[PDB]
Paper text:
The folate metabolism enzyme MTHFD2 (methylenetetrahydrofolate dehydrogenase/cyclohydrolase) is consistently overexpressed in cancer but its roles are not fully characterized, and current candidate inhibitors have limited potency for clinical development. Indeed, the one-carbon metabolism enzyme MTHFD2 stands out as the most consistently overexpressed metabolic enzyme across human tumors. MTHFD2 enzymatic function supports rapid cell proliferation during early embryogenesis, after which it is replaced by the mitochondrial protein MTHFD2L in healthy mature tissue.
The tool compound TH7299, as well as two of the most promising candidates, TH9028 and TH9619, were chosen to investigate the MTHFD2 mechanism of action and cancer biology. Furthermore, we determined the cocrystal structures of TH7299, TH9028 and TH9619 in complexes with human MTHFD2 to assess their binding mode and identify critical interactions in the binding pocket. In the present study, we show that, in contrast to the characteristic promiscuity and polypharmacology of antifolates such as methotrexate (MTX) and pemetrexed (PMTX), TH9619 displayed high selectivity toward binding and stabilizing MTHFD2 over other common folate metabolism targets such as dihydrofolate reductase (DHFR), thymidylate synthase (TYMS), serine hydroxymethyltransferase (SHMT) 1 and SHMT2. We could confirm MTHFD2 stabilization against thermal degradation on incubation with TH9619 in cell lysates and live cells using CETSA, demonstrating intracellular target engagement. To evaluate whether targeting MTHFD2 was responsible for the observed toxicity on MTHFD2 inhibitors in cancer cells, we generated MTHFD2−/− clustered regularly interspaced short palindromic repeats (CRISPR)–Cas9 knockout cells and found that they were several orders of magnitude more resistant to TH9619 than parental MTHFD2 WT cells, but not MTHFD1−/− cells.
Numbering used by the authors:
A (entry chain B): 36 to 333
B (entry chain A): 36 to 280, 289 to 332
The structure:
């Protein structure tokens, strides 16, 4: 039966580390780090998630604010705000919670944020640098997945890894980190990586996961991954956060992409949803904010 | 036996497309495109390849010059030259042939070329845009591999593909093009892609290639792919160009029984590399950023 990795405990340890580091930075008489978060509209998940981020900033010694804007705001208005904050020498990190409404182009917004305040790592320069194995602001969810693997001592060099999902801020950067050279400026995990997506036929997915020492599911599909697909002792990391309705009572429940109960038999490791990858995302963003405050990637 | 794909012939087709496009463009008022190539040192592969590029330029009606410099050139000189060429409005495309001498930072050189004139697609912005499936200057070898697959009619959507190698200008971009979404601004092939490299155990490689409708080898290792690694009827694309006693990364002679399609070396991907660069030069001349 599978060791269950608590991403909540790990995230909490990492927050303690950022706390000490912020205490230190300030005791040396530096400006306290400041994170600004922009939230557009009323997606409830977006609200909960931004709540989690600002709390985390509070508890690790980072000053936060959330600027909430109505969904009817124009792209131009959002850009004027971004520009104010890029020019405010008090703001170390600046993030815009996603998704944005359809009249606003996310890519133009992500590229408007100053690369050295880009704690999400979504600016095209950060994406380019990451894809070239250079130092960059790494994106929080993928770096969280990496820390779960690395801090649990699960090896990656030479190993087979499958990532279900190819989204530009989750699946793609996860696949990039895991396959790349450990000897490079930004080290990778030297694994053999397969990437699947919405057109991977389910039988062919299974044919690749069955060979996998590590399966990382970032598709947003309940019960995508089941124990017949996993091999004995493999690590299984679950990036999905899927809001379902619970058969016994149609209560609103969070599952991931893995059939936890089925897979926790056969697997060597497993993360739960909730309390797995999600809090790690919040922890790695605290890390990026301290990094941005210390202006080390200038 | 396997259908042997002629890169020589597909490249001919592409170069005729560019010739026509260039001729309409000049005919309708515009400056004739110009490609400037910077060559440093005496690597015989580099010299041969830069000659192939400028010949192709000449025959599709694109003006060229190669600027040859000694290996001894300093990084500051090379950047000075690049800066001059970035400002010369006669120059549409600018490329610096690799590899550069060990005392020159390649990445610094690559980022110094104006993105508008970056016909190799090695500038960090071009790499970033490509990884986001945005319009970009696609790198020549990866776009060549893509054109080989799509002009030969080999399907990719839902299919299994293995790329052997993860170099930033070949193997990584090939994997990026093949797995990405056909509906995006810069379409991809909607395939299921495995990337392998110098730490993939050979048996594990084989366990992936066995499943593969397409195997693309960009490792630079003679005989890495052998017919027991292929599944019958599969497309094998050989990006390797190795000096031994020129051959690929495939055992051509063996794999051609088992394979559905196969590319030779020479005459496969290499001539396509040259062709796609001509494509990129006319795209740069037209200033469709
Ligand atoms: N600019 C930008 N950047 C981004 O990074 C992201 C991604 C992101 O914020 N992800 C998450 C994920 N999970 C949590 C979390 O708290 N998860 C808990 C459950 C809490 C509950 O159910 O409400 C868990 O999974 O246990 C979080 F705070 C943030 C977006 N959308 N936008
Ligand atoms: N900035 C930059 N950009 C780059 O794109 C490249 C890569 C590159 O130039 N690739 C190639 C590959 N092959 C050929 C070729 O003509 N191959 C013939 C064999 C001819 C013979 O040497 O006898 C074949 O394979 O049939 C070519 F002209 C260029 C580099 N290095 N640098
Ligand atoms: N056994 C192997 N299987 C797959 N890829 C390999 C193997 N051995 C080496 N490689 C890869 O080949 C590449 C060598 O780089 P390079 O020669 O610069 O690229 P190219 O083949 O495009 O010229 C590296 O990415 C390396 O990890």
């Amino acid at each position: 039966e599978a060791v269950v990795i608590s991403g909540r405990k790990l995230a909490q340890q990492i927050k303690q580390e950022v706390r000490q580091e912020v205490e230190e930075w300030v005791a040396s008489g530096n400006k306290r780090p400041h994170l600004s978060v922009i939230l557009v509209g009323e997606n409830p998940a977006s609200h909960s998630y931004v709540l989690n981020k600002t709390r985390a900033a509070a508890v690790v010694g980072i000053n936060s604010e959330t600027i909430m804007k109505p969904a009817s705001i124009s792209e131009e208005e959002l850009l004027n705000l971004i520009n104010k904050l890029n020019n405010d020498d008090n703001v170390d990190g600046l993030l815009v919670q996603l998704p944005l409404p359809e009249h606003i182009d996310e890519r133009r917004i992500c590229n408007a944020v100053s690369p050295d305040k880009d704690v999400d790592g979504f600016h095209v320069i950060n994406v380019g640098r990451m894809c070239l194995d250079q130092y960059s602001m790494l994106p929080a969810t993928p770096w969280g997945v990496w820390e779960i693997i690395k801090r649990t001592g699960i090896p990656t060099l030479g190993k087979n890894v499958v990532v279900a999902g190819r989204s530009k801020n989750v699946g793609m950067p996860i696949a990039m980190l895991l396959h790349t050279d450990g000897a490079h400026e930004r080290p990778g995990g030297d694994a053999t990586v397969t990437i699947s997506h919405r057109y991977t036929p389910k039988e062919q997915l299974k044919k690749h996961t069955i060979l996998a020492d590590i399966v990382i599911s970032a598709a947003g599909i309940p019960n995508l991954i089941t124990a017949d697909m996993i091999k004995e002792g493999a690590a299984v990391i679950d990036v999905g956060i899927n809001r379902v309705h619970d058969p016994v009572t149609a209560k609103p429940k969070l599952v991931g992409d893995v059939d936890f109960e089925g897979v926790r038999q056969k697997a060597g490791y497993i993360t739960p949803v909730p309390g797995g990858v999600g809090p790690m995302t919040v922890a790695m963003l605290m890390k990026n904010t301290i990094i941005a405050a210390k202006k080390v990637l200038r």
